[PDB]
Design a protein around this ligand. Structure first.
Ligand SMILES: COc1cc([C@@H]2c3cc4c(cc3[C@@H](Nc3ccc5[nH]ncc5c3)[C@H]3COC(=O)[C@H]23)OCO4)cc(OC)c1OC
Ligand SMILES: Nc1nc2c(ncn2[C@@H]2O[C@H](COP(=O)(O)OP(=O)(O)OP(=O)(O)O)[C@@H](O)[C@H]2O)c(=O)[nH]1
Ligand SMILES: Nc1ncnc2c1ncn2[C@@H]1O[C@H](COP(=O)(O)OP(=O)(O)CP(=O)(O)O)[C@@H](O)[C@H]1O
Ligand SMILES: Nc1nc2c(ncn2[C@@H]2O[C@H](COP(=O)(O)OP(=O)(O)O)[C@@H](O)[C@H]2O)c(=O)[nH]1
Ligand SMILES: [Ca+2]
Ligand SMILES: [Mg+2]
Ligand SMILES: [Mg+2]
Ligand code: NA
Lengths: 419, 437, 54, 268
């Protein structure tokens, strides 16, 4: 059950690169690909994200319309570990236009990328599906990313499709036209992804600014929370244990209805030598200020929830905490889905933490995020502002209208069940 | 006469490995399969030959097949101590599991592997001179356990027709790991196998789990604990087939003695005494004591209150130092101080089998060896309580049609949910008619 | 309580105490259902591939 | 903190009890269908017990004893007296054809044309004033019998009074205390019924625990002998006695299981 990782665009390539670094450390793989871990656990499911001179190579394909981002990764610490042939980029760049990526200047490279993917999928003994990282509000990963997803779905319609999509935010914005690109991407994902982890570039900032007390968070700061969250969700897949989660089972248990495949990640300790108590981890995990999506769970209701606790800790005390939360917060849990919350414990703790907790929740509150994006789109789209940059590529206002609508429907759906 | 056991899903396999281990310890067969006690090298018609076969080398091989849609579990058997014991063909693994989906294991993945498993079963049947039936062990929640099992039930009902088949299903427990869609899977597989199953013993992980916390003082029972306790219970039931006895000596005797009506083929099990091996000295419970413990819900494998249900049949199976007089005395005492009521169409009686051989506990297990034990198999309407619960759950999800799509996507149709749910609803009415006055 | 059907053997004994007296589907049909799904499934997959082509 | 779910809105007594639970600052009301309730004011009819006591890491308690309808229902009560060996002079005879075997002969032909046939108490103790002795008895999860101290006594022709006042009349008019004249037989009657049905309804080892308040009707004759009329599974309470009894119910039953005497300990 190999997972073909795929990272596109600047943001996608930056966060994906750290994700590899982090999970390589945890799995005791150094930049050269050799292994030096002290426990076999590390090598027991390493094939989920690595392929083996007894060296593990990440099963990752890097994609970009400009060399710069991919060249930095190559120069990065683990730049060696990434397979050179898996590097796949062009020179045109996407000028931050979904169009330029999903239509004009991506249709070229997309084929090249599908070839590497095909090669990775062939070697895979049992292809679990595909993992993708991108920023819904840019050009290559917003637009070209959703294009590759569609292509991928046609070739591999029996595989799980999961995306770590980085929702753009005014607090951390690059261009006025970022809402437009997000709305188009959102609708692509609604239809061609089974699982999407919404990482709001807003929240991350907040967390950093407020909690972590960082006046001028840089993109690295946000990326650091992102890599941690990533390792979290991916733990059960990487490391063996009682619950050997897989993409399909993950979708089967957390997705009551297809369109509703957007999840609010949460992590604690938000970074330290004082290991938190199992009660502490459990209260922070569900803490809004510890969720990477900028939505209040109290404003909606948890369809489904899944927790993981890495590190040595009392399994019983863990179960007790979870039970308490559910019982004290019964109103925030859908009644129609019995037992909608489940927890799992991994012995290997995150890097540099004695113990942590990762939260994955399909809350109706997630609609807040899409409402924000929809309002922005509406603001500009009501006056057709900046639309010429897309109409120049051959797009049509109607297509903007459609995507706008769909994202509103999705918002409605989350509310329906909320009430 | 021989019993081919079939293990489907993780549970089945797991529990299986356990049952077969206990069987090899009871029957003094070494892990190599070489049984020193056995003097019929590669032959004989002894009682234990019902579940084992003697090779020309003198090794004995269980007459069962371990099969799962994923391999990692059955690979453990292949790499386990009893690895030699089991023949590779007996071990049938696949590439991908049903990912917790009845429809996925029954239709999508069921068809691909159904014939291969039927072939293996058939190779076993051919080696058997007179197959008594098949013992299927599985779990309601998992999608291999439910989907693929129910498909194998229909096939075995067709290919082996007459031969009898006893179930050993694992009712879903929220405390224990469980998928959210497990109530769906449970109803579906129930409905499909309801006519393919001669007698179904359910084991609620919720009950087994608390029993391990309570008697064995285990804070977080692992599957291993739970499976060991279950194996002790299976061994008590399978012991009439594996040893010489007049009670339940063939699979038919279980249905004849315990199942009055085909739909009500689910008998509640209760076992005593469960003692912690960590305790150095344990009070030796009497025949009357163990006998009475059988009438306590804590010692039931499926929580439910028999006081509010009529009995259709009851059988007590003692293992250890137990005499008929003790049993009669305990029965009498308990009857006077117990709220035991049998249906009118049934006589108030208890078929008692006693095996002089004492209970067998695995070395280093958390179960302390006892000098006597009893396991009571009684068909009470109270078991229908466990149906209700599951049913309720289903409903709550099915009203929103939550998680249905997945199944529908596997080719299944939304109507089948209603069919299976009606059938459970009938089965719940039947229980209430037989018992509720 | 009346004990009856008392059988003694080297392995064990059994008896019966009574406190009180009392007052299919054809393989084709199986397979036909399985194949039906197949089709239904296929239909869906086709629809998806056709939406992809559009 | 504690959670409770009120499923019996018509229950006045338990309505007050749930309000007190709210007042404690340690008890909060949940959705009637919310599974994660520590306590349940189940409905008087068709209360679901098969789903109780199966919620992981949750202690569940219910304001009714499963199987207690036998003592409560008038028809089951008579059967219970007659079938039960333990259960009987204090209970007025009640009724097939044996009723005719009629052969004082009042009961409570035309009647048969129009249930149970219990001989009417032709000679009733009159203060000529007929009164009904209402006693409230609560049974916790230990099946300890407790008898609310306060009681209510609810012209005659052959053809609400407090215990204290009634006792005063007994002493002034009959030279006797309510306790020795009537209240001793009440206790014996109560214990007899409850302890008879105790094995059948005991929740000691059951996965859910139970408790329930009962109202017993007693009729005293000219000889000051108490007579059981009916047992009420969901008895109301005197308006004045409501606060004390409900508060007591909360402290003895809700609080013993879920820790945050106006009663007589018949059993303990
Ligand atoms: C938090 O921990 C995780 C849980 C899951 C989901 C999941 C999601 C849920 C849920 C239960 C389950 C659980 N489902 C399951 C599967 C097989 C079973 N067999 N027997 C019981 C049983 C139960 C996981 C075991 O495999 C999965 O992928 C599943 O409840 C509502 O949301 C995936 C993970 O990866 C990202 C994960 O890591 C973080
Ligand atoms: N008692 C016991 N219960 C088990 C065991 N393994 C799994 N379970 C139960 O199994 C249910 C899930 O079914 P599985 O056996 O895991 O599923 P499966 O048959 O492998 O089918 P898949 O879904 O494809 O993996 C849960 O409700 C668990 O409670 C076990 O080894 N012992
Ligand atoms: N055999 C008898 N002799 C004399 N009086 C009787 C009697 N049976 C009943 N009564 C009186 O008639 C009334 C009817 O009895 P019962 O208690 O059944 O009333 P009821 O049907 O309203 C139930 P409850 O009074 O508990 O609400 C009682 O209050 C009692 O005082
Ligand atoms: N968290 C995070 N967000 C980023 C990062 N880089 C860019 N972004 C966001 O990505 C959006 C712009 O997309 P970009 O990376 O430039 O996409 P591209 O056209 O494919 O390169 C902006 O909202 C930034 O907020 C990063 O490294 N980390
Ligand atoms: Ca032999
Ligand atoms: Mg950029
Ligand atoms: Mg499995
Ligand atoms: Na070009």
């Amino acid at each position: 059950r190999e997972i073909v990782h795929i990272q596109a665009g600047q943001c996608g390539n930056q966060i994906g690169a750290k994700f590899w670094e982090v999970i390589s450390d945890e799995h005791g793989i150094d930049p050269t690909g050799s292994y030096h871990g002290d426990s076999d656990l590390q090598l027991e499911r390493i094939n989920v994200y690595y392929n083996e001179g007894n060296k593990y190579v990440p099963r990752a394909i890097l994609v970009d319309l400009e060399p710069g981002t991919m060249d930095s990764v190559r120069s990065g610490p683990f730049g060696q570990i990434f397979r050179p042939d898996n590097f796949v980029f062009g020179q045109s760049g996407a000028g931050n236009n979904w169009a330029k990526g999903h239509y004009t200047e991506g249709a070229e490279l997309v084929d090249s990328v599908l070839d590497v993917v095909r090669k990775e999928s062939e070697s895979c003994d049992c292809l679990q599906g595909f993992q993708l990282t991108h920023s819904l509000g840019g050009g290559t990963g917003s637009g070209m990313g959703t294009l590759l997803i569609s292509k991928i779905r046609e070739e591999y319609p029996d595989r799980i499709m999961n995306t770590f999509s980085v929702m753009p935010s005014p607090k951390v914005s690059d261009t006025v036209v970022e809402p437009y690109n997000a709305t188009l991407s959102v609708h692509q994902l609604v239809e061609n992804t089974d699982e999407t982890y919404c990482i709001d570039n807003e929240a991350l900032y907040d967390i950093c600014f407020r909690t972590l007390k960082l006046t001028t968070p840089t993109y690295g700061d946000l990326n650091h929370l992102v890599s941690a969250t990533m390792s979290g969700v991916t733990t059960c897949l990487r490391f063996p244990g009682q619950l050997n989660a897989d993409l399909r089972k993950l979708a089967v248990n957390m997705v009551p209805f297809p369109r509703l495949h957007f999840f609010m990640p949460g992590f604690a300790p938000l970074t330290q030598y004082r290991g938190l108590t199992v009660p502490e981890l459990t209260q922070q995990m569900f803490d809004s200020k510890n969720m990477m999506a900028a939505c209040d769970p109290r404003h909606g209701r948890y369809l489904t929830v899944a927790a993981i606790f890495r590190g040595r800790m009392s399994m019983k005390e863990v179960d007790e905490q979870m039970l308490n939360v559910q019982n004290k917060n019964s109103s925030y849990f859908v009644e129609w889905i019995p037992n909608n919350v489940k927890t799992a414990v991994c012995d290997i703790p995150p890097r540099g933490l004695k113990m942590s907790a990762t939260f994955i929740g399909n809350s109706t509150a997630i609609q807040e995020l899409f409402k924000r994006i929809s309002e922005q789109f509406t603001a500009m789209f009501r006056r057709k502002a900046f639309l010429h940059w897309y109409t120049g590529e051959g797009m049509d206002e109607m297509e903007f209208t459609e995507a706008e609508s769909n994202m509103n429907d999705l918002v409605s759906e989350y509310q329906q069940y909320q009430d | 006469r021989e019993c081919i056991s079939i293990h489907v899903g993780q549970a089945g396999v797991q529990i299986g490995n356990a049952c077969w281990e206990l069987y090899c310890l009871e029957h003094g067969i070494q892990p190599d399969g070489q049984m020193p006690s056995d003097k019929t090298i590669g032959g004989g018609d002894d009682s234990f030959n019902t579940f084992f076969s003697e090779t020309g080398a003198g090794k004995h091989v269980p007459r069962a097949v371990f099969v799962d849609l994923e391999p990692t579990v059955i690979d453990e058997v292949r790499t386990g101590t009893y690895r030699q014991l089991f023949h590779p063909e007996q071990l049938i693994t696949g590439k991908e599991d049903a990912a917790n989906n009845y429809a996925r294991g029954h239709y999508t993945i069921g068809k691909e592997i159904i014939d291969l498993v039927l072939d293996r079963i058939r190779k076993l049947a051919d080696q058997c001179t007179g197959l008594q039936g098949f013992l299927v062990f599985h779990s309601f929640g998992g999608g291999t356990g439910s989907g693929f099992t129910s498909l194998l039930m229909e096939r075995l009902s067709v290919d082996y027709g007459k031969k009898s088949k006893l179930e050993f299903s694992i009712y879903p427990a929220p405390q224990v790991s469980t998928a959210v869609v497990e109530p769906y899977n449970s109803i579906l597989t129930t409905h499909t196998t309801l006519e393919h199953s001669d007698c179904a013993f359910m084991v609620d992980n919720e009950a087994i789990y608390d029993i391990c916390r309570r008697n064995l003082d285990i804070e977080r029972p692992t599957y291993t604990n739970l499976n060991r306790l279950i194996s002790q219970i299976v061994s008590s039931i399978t012991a009439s087939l594996r040893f010489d006895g007049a009670l339940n000596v063939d699979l038919t005797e279980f249905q004849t003695n315990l199942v009055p009506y085909p739909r009500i083929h689910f008998p509640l099990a209760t076992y005593a005494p469960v003692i912690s091996a960590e305790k150095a000295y344990h009070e030796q419970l009497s025949v009357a004591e163990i006998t009475n413990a059988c009438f306590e819900p804590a010692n039931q494998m499926v929580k439910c209150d028999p006081r509010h249900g009529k009995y259709m049949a009851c059988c007590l199976l003692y293992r250890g130092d137990v005499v008929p007089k003790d049993v009669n005395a305990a029965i009498a005492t308990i009857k006077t101080k117990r709220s035991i009521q049998f249906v009118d169409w049934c006589p108030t009686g208890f078929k008692v089998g006693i095996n002089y051989q004492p209970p067998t506990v695995v070395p280093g297990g958390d179960l302390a060896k006892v000098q006597r034990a009893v396991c009571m198999l009684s068909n009470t309407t109270a078991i229908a309580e466990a149906w209700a619960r599951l049913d309720h759950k289903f409903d709550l999800m099915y009203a929103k049609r939550a998680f249905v799509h997945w199944y529908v996507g596997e080719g299944m149709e939304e109507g089948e949910f209603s069919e299976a749910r009606e059938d459970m609803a009938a089965l719940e009415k039947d229980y209430e008619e037989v018992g509720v006055d | 309580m009346e004990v009856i059907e008392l059988n003694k053997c080297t392995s064990g004994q059994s008896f019966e105490v009574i406190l009180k007296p009392p007052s299919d589907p054809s393989l084709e049909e199986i397979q036909k259902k399985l194949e039906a799904a197949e089709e239904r499934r296929k239909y869906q997959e086709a629809e998806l591939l056709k939406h992809l082509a559009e | 903190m504690y959670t409770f779910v009120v499923r019996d809105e018509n229950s006045s007594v338990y309505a007050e009890v749930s309000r007190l639970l709210l007042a404690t600052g340690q008890w909060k009301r949940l959705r009637k269908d919310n599974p994660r309730f520590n306590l349940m004011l189940g409905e008087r009819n068709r209360l679901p017990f098969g789903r109780l006591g199966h919620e992981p890491g949750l202690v569940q308690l219910v304001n009714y004893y499963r199987g207690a309808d036998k003592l409560c229902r008038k028809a089951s009560l008579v059967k219970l007296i007659k079938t039960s060996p333990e259960l009987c002079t204090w209970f007025p005879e009640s009724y097939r054809e044996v009723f005719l075997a009629y052969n004082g002969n009042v009961w409570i032909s035309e009647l048969l044309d129009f249930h149970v046939i219990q001989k009417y108490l032709e000679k009733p103790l009159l203060l000529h004033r007929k009164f009904d002795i209402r006693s409230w008895v609560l049974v916790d999860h230990l099946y300890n019998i407790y008898l609310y101290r306060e009681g209510v006594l609810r012209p005659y022709n052959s053809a609400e009074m407090f215990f204290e006042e009634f006792n005063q009349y007994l002493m002034d008019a009959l030279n006797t205390t309510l306790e020795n004249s009537i209240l001793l037989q009440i206790k014996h009657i109560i214990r007899s019924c409850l302890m008879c049905i105790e094995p059948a309804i005991s929740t000691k080892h059951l996965h859910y625990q139970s408790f329930q308040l009962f109202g017993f009707d007693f009729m005293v004759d000219e000889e000051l002998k108490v007579w059981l009329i009916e047992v009420n599974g969901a008895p109301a309470c005197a308006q004045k006695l409501y606060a004390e009894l409900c508060q007591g119910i909360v402290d003895v039953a809700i609080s013993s299981v879920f820790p945050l005497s106006i009663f007589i300990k018949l059993l303990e």
